[PDB]
Design a protein around this ligand. Structure first.
Ligand SMILES: O=C(O)c1[nH]c2ccc(F)cc2c1NC(=O)[C@H]1C[C@@H]1c1ccccc1
Length: 230
């Protein structure tokens, strides 16, 4: 997160760190007792690397009573995702067992109504991604409040030039933004999950290249079908 601040420890009990061979790779969000939602590019080249999900965390490195690193039974990328496109960039991780819930670990309700968030709505994004242009990695969770940017502005030639489909939404990126390592994490508006940070390479903190987020309401039937797979 560029331009943000340290999050209140455990105030976002749905936040997940998706890890590959014990290192933070991407954000994620606990959406059901046994399932974490994230982005597909995060793992597209992960091969047989060990994927785990850290829940109940603030610090990546320090012990905390609520912190638990879960193994993953199954990783389920969206079947229409592809390397090198921004579309359908969703991934579901089935934990090896249902998460132990409490005040620091709780699924986040997620949007099913497939209608746009009002322009300018202030939404929260959190993560453990880079915090400056040199790439410094924070030990603890950072966050920032970002206003939703209307799709037509986001689609101007000067911005994303028509790439923002109905299944995607934008948030402003002027000096406050999600950056490398924050992808896959949640964009939360009015206490409900609205978007998942896309995980393609994007410049960080340039107002002319807004943040792009996959709209979870647009993928409700897919999320429900993977969960019913259990
Ligand atoms: O976050 C992302 O947008 C993103 N998209 C990807 C696509 C392929 C892919 F193989 C990885 C990624 C990845 N994450 C990362 O590279 C994580 C490694 C970097 C990181 C940055 C700051 C703090 C901790 C760790």
């Amino acid at each position: 997160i560029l331009g943000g601040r340290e999050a209140e420890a455990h105030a976002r009990p749905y936040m997940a760190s998706v890890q590959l061979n014990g290192a933070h790779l991407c954000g994620g969000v606990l959406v059901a007792e046994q399932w974490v939602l994230s982005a597909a590019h995060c793992l597209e080249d992960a091969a047989d690397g060990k994927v785990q999900v850290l829940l109940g965390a603030h610090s990546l490195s320090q012990p905390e009573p609520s912190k638990r690193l879960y193994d993953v039974l199954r990783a389920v990328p969206h079947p229409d995702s592809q390397p090198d496109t921004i579309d359908h960039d969703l991934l579901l991780l089935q934990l090896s067992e249902k998460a132990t819930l409490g005040p620091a670990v709780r699924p986040l309700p997620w949007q099913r109504v497939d209608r746009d968030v009002a322009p300018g709505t202030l939404c929260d994004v959190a993560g453990w991604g880079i915090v400056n242009h040199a790439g410094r990695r924070p030990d603890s969770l950072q966050h920032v409040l970002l206003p939703v940017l209307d799709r037509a502005t986001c689609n101007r030639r000067t911005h994303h030039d028509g790439a923002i489909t109905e299944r995607l939404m934008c948030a402003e990126s002027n000096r406050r933004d999600s950056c490398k390592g924050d992808s896959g994490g949640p964009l939360v508006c009015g206490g409900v999950l609205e978007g998942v940070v896309t995980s393609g390479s994007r410049v960080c903190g340039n107002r002319k290249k807004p943040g792009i987020y996959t709209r979870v309401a647009s993928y409700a039937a897919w999320i429900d079908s993977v969960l019913a797979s259990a």
